Amino acid sequence: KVFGRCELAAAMKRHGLDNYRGYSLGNWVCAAKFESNFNTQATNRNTDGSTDYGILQINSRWWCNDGRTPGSRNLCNIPCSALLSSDITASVNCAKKIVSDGNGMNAWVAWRNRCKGTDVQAWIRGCRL
Ligand SMILES: [Cl-]
Ligand SMILES: [Cl-]
Ligand SMILES: [Cl-]
Ligand SMILES: [Cl-]
Ligand SMILES: [Cl-]
Ligand SMILES: [Cl-]
Ligand SMILES: [Cl-]
Ligand code: NA
Incomplete structure (x- = not known):
């Protein structure tokens, strides 16, 4: 599923990410x-x-098991395929564990490089939330 911007914001809020x-x-x-x-x-x-x-x-x-990553862990206790669902519950629940791991959102290199410090509120601007 490809979410719209405000549609994803609403789903993330519903699942307790805000x-x-x-x-x-x-x-x-x-x-x-x-x-x-x-x-x-x-x-x-x-x-x-x-x-x-x-x-x-x-x-x-x-964070997840895909059966083909030697020496890896599965700390979210889920098949990686669950992270591809149109229902974002598994991704959100696992993201909560990741962001709690010590380095906050820096765990996502793209967040550090492209979001951190920017006007992130622009991403939810206009959204009915
Ligand atoms: Cl967009
Ligand atoms: Cl594996
Ligand atoms: Cl594990
Ligand atoms: Cl599995
Ligand atoms: Cl969802
Ligand atoms: Cl933090
Ligand atoms: Cl914001
Ligand atoms: Na793994």
Whole structure:
């Protein structure tokens, strides 16, 4: 599923991401924009052989099981395929664990490089929320 901007903001808010660990909704929308272009089915292979899955490009090295990432963990206790669903629940629940891991949203390199410090509220501007 490719979400619209405000549609994803609303779904993220419904699932409790707005101000989660102190990160406003616009931060989460911005991260999803640059990780996946709002596409739940996005996948990307990393150089190390792990793969990133879904709207927030969650990595198989630590967070989900895809059966093909040697030495990896599955700390969200989910198949990586669950991160590709039109229902964002699994991605949101796993993102909550990731953002709580110690480095906040810096875990998402694209957030650090493209969202951090910017006018992230622009991402939810106009949205009925
Ligand atoms: Cl957009
Ligand atoms: Cl915001
Ligand atoms: Cl594996
Ligand atoms: Cl594990
Ligand atoms: Cl599994
Ligand atoms: Cl959803
Ligand atoms: Cl933080
Ligand atoms: Na894994």
